[PDB]
Amino acid sequence: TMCYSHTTTSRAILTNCGENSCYRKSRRHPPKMVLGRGCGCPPGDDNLEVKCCTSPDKCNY
Amino acid sequence: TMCYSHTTTSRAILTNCGENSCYRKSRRHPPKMVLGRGCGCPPGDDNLEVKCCTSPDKCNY
Amino acid sequence: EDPQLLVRVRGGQLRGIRLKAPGGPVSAFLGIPFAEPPVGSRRFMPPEPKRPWSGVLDATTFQNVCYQYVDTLYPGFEGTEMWNPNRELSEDCLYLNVWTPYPRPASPTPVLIWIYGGGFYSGAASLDVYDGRFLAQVEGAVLVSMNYRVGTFGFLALPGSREAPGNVGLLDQRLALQWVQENIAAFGGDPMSVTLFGESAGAASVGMHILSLPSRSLFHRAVLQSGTPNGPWATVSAGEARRRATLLARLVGCNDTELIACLRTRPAQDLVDHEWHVLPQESIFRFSFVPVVDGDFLSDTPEALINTGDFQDLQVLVGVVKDEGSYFLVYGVPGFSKDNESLISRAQFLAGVRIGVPQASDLAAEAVVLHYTDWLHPEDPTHLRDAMSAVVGDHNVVCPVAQLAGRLAAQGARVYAYIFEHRASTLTWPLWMGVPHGYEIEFIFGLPLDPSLNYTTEERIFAQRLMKYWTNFARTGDPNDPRDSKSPQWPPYTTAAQQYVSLNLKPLEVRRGLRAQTCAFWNRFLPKLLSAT
Amino acid sequence: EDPQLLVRVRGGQLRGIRLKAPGGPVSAFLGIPFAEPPVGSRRFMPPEPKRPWSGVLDATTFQNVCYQYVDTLYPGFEGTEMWNPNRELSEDCLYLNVWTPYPRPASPTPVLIWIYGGGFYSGAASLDVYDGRFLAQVEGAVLVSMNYRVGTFGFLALPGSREAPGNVGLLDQRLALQWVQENIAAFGGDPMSVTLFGESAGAASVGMHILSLPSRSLFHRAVLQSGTPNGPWATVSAGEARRRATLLARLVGCNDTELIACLRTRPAQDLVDHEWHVLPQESIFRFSFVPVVDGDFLSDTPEALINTGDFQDLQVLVGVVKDEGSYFLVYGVPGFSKDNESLISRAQFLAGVRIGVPQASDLAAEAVVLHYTDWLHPEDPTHLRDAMSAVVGDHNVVCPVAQLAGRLAAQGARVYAYIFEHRASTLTWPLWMGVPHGYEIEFIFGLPLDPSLNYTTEERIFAQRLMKYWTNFARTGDPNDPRDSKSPQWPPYTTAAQQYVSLNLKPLEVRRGLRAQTCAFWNRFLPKLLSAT
């Protein structure tokens, strides 16, 4: 599956995550800043929401 | 002009240098390791040769 | 390599490059280092000048971009991304660029130094929008633009400590000012005509500069586009700055010097990763590391200074874009999206106020809703949407602008105000956002002048006129043409009549009182209420 | 998310991922952290274990790649680039991966830990070649692979100092060994069957491990592919290590702890940028930061240890690729190029020797030329070309291999030697380079087994057999099949008969004496000459 990948210092690249879940790590409270997306689905904390999807491409938008 | 760009920690990317000279910074004495290429033509030192070209694309190979 | 792009500067020789503008050749000197790379144990410290080099310094291109955060809110979206850095990130980033017409004139020319905006956590002169290419060729001006340290690096402060005094971000830019005051001449640059202009956080720095004497004397005129040194977002108490730094320090994994010591061992990526967490209350248009009242650079709050400084000898241009606050709503104000009308309910509008005006306690929040709710239509989503954007624009930009302008006109300074009301035909944001924060720079710089770029004839002839205004101001002080002029003359904002014009495809239309009423609330009332709660 | 890819490990729970091999499902647990991120003030220090985590740890992918240098000698050239890191560089890089068949067997299985090579300045288990995918599914083995710190970070040492003891790169890998000795069981991994194998600098580490007791006891068997702990490139005196570090330190911009202190404030990019300069004499196959004889990890030189250690209880597989030295000639030995036959003259061959054997003074250099020149055809470019490559291969790999093998067989250890002679049909390098350094891994790992990958039937059936050899060794010690066997049995390298086989598309062909003559020169004579000059 095609998802977006980047740290807090990278541009949004598109990396084939194969048959796996990809994330979106963002700040929980306003300003809800995006702190990076990638493949896999990691555990977040109260400081940051982590939405994880599986389909389709760019679903971790 | 299309040249290659990279530091000692980057992959060889191709960046349009427009109408300008692009370099190749390499170690002077064996092992003649490549320490990076880019646009422009900078001054090297006895520690590293800097070849500069103008044409054609990928000339700073 | 051998034409007249070779220059001796107080530190060595440099070889520029001839860039071709739509109307002809240009002399660009991209990359000039003006300070020792503030890396290793020089991070968090004030800038130190660049030791002289031997031989000829290449200057055919842009250098690094100060390590910073990349907004990835909208992957691939032009509107959002056009602000992202366009060069490798590195702490070794302090370099200024210079632009001169081809060939550099014998006659000294007015200098325009541009300070990039970026809410003090982002920005780079390396950006396309800030292309001095046109403003130099067409208008025959000499532009300049440094790279100041932003973020953790540029403003972390533990006040009353020699390791991290803070405001260093401003210090770097000050340096670039000096390099000009002792080098720009060699580019045919009039060392008197210096006219520093800026947008948002940058515009705040300019203001920050005409308030500190050490800086003041390095320029003559000044322009402030959508930002002020006196807003609620550009300054922090020596105590709050001291609070966040320590918090971050703990967040990372870290006794003042000791605290700093550990900080200097910590990775830029590590620091960037953790700056958005020292922010106290959930809010928008509220940034974590900005200039702090150290009682050294800024001897007292911007307000006190503005309140008493002598200004009769200063020409100033200050302005606002129509819809300021719109931009930030998408960063976490319930209901808003760039993918829909963002028709909000009175239910959400209430939360909207709590966020946008985050320092205000309950009662004041009530004061805001009262003032912005249309009691004959209190639940109309449309009005509520707009009103929501309005609270942010006024609270942060417009009102504080109107204020600086006011207090400045009284102390004798020549003030000209304006409100840019043109939404570009190329905007990517929805129609409901209007003319958002920063969407005038595109024109001030002359981008529409490049025939490859898509725009409209009207917009082109428009951008040309705007360019003239800016330059004219930079060249004399009055943003108006002589006898050969579009007769609707631009009236100097006088405290009494409060006139100012409107910038758009149609000729200068004067108006009186910039948000007189709403601002009286904000600037006058709100403070008192806050002190009482 | 909920199948049987969930595992409790002594520190928390982890969720793996089901990877599909050409022959069926595989259980891969990519990403397992095994130590506290050695960043900030933990750089240059020995690893520290990973504090336990709460909840379930995602383990569906590869982590970072230890900050390192990227070889950009040949932009776009498969041969060169296939070795470049394939993940973001970060000091936060210590993570091991694990592979088990789907589903993980109840029956304990032999474990194969793979240490990547990279001349101690590069490498990553994250690489495709090191895909445990096949070796696990097809052979039913449990593979593992850590990421040790390489470069400045992994080996800078100021011996006799607690801040930068050195050899820490090795320490990390040791840790991964322990994590296995106290966790691999949970993957159906036999905690006894551990068989660590490696290539080049990695292969040197394995050797490095069976020489230090603390390590030794964490594995049972051992394999060394084209590298030895006793070569002239894998070790440095406590004094030389101490020399380079200080030099680099000065190069950067930097009292032992103080020296280190400054080093820790300095940028990874900064450090990487400057490591190739502490190298004393111009040379090839000579790396700047490698394990140092600290008299702690390696109590004495690898040679002394090899010379006296008890080995009767150790099974070992040691081997060499046909053309070892060829690869490095292109890094600065006059005449050589991958874009031509590289037909050298006796004029250049002379300089060639000076570089390749850089520690040898004039007279010894003479000794080399004598030995390698064909006096009945002293100027034949072809012979000279080959002979040039030969001096490098022998000097660095083959001879020291033959030596370790020798001294080891005497001390009772079960030794099997081989020489892989198959040039892949997919090689990108010129024909004159033969079967270069590292071009067997492709097969050992089973890559040809993937039908999407281009190769030849012969090569496929070939790779299968090789896989069997390795596993068989890992599963018992004798790299041979039982009664059901390709009868040409692999003879254990006995000091007396010095037999060993050849790995290629044709059946095992035994031979006696691995470079007996040339090595006698190198291993025996050359040293003495050097001591005398």
Ligand SMILES: *[C@@H]1O[C@H](CO)[C@@H](O)[C@H](O)[C@H]1NC(C)=O
């Ligand atoms: C607009 O989009 C946002 C984000 O998807 C959503 O919260 C909101 O409900 C949508 N509708 C309106 C009327 O704003």
Ligand SMILES: *[C@@H]1O[C@H](CO)[C@@H](O)[C@H](O)[C@H]1NC(C)=O
């Ligand atoms: C081969 O290529 C290299 C590099 O371009 C060059 O030095 C050499 O002269 C060429 N010819 C031969 C015969 O090696």
